[PDB]
Amino acid sequence: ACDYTCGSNCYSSSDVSTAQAAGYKLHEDGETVGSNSYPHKYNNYEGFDFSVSSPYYEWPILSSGDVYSGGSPGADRVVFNENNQLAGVITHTGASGNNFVECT
Ligand code: VO4
Ligand SMILES: [Ca+2]
């Protein structure tokens, strides 16, 4: 079973934990990877009920389970805050333009 499912992608809590740890360390190092510079700030304009406070940052989580290192970031993302607290898992899948929907 999947702890989070984004579209057709299934993630376990260990997949989320692994991806967040890598995104958080680049954020502490003031480093980014990929053409779209991840991790980068996330603005909650869609109003997702996250129980952890802002600011928020997004980093790609890959269906392969590999940690993102550059190349195509896919559609899904882990969102974490300044305190390295997980806020949610969201995706561009099934959302228009560059809007997001939450993974379930
Ligand atoms: O870098 V994205 O916000 O377009 O997921
Ligand atoms: Ca996995």
Side-chain angles (χ1 to χ4, degrees), residues 7-103:
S8 289
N9 301 332
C10 183
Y11 298 115
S12 54
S13 282
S14 56
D15 287 318
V16 169
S17 292
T18 298
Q20 186 190 337
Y24 198 77
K25 138 258 156 187
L26 263 6
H27 169 73
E28 294 177 304
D29 292 351
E31 257 297 291
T32 69
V33 285
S35 302
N36 303 151
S37 297
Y38 295 94
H40 58 60
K41 228 196 189 91
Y42 169 74
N43 297 117
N44 194 32
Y45 54 89
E46 304 289 346
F48 298 136
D49 192 65
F50 304 134
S51 45
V52 116
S53 56
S54 225
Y56 300 118
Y57 299 89
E58 34 165 321
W59 170 252
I61 176 166
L62 304 172
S63 68
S64 64
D66 293 323
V67 163
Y68 176 79
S69 84
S72 187
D76 312 325
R77 313 268 173 270
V78 164
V79 184
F80 55 85
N81 75 350
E82 217 61 67
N83 299 168
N84 187 213
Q85 292 170 289
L86 205 222
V89 177
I90 66 178
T91 180
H92 278 308
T93 293
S96 70
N98 267 239
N99 280 55
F100 291 92
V101 293
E102 237 150 350
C103 299

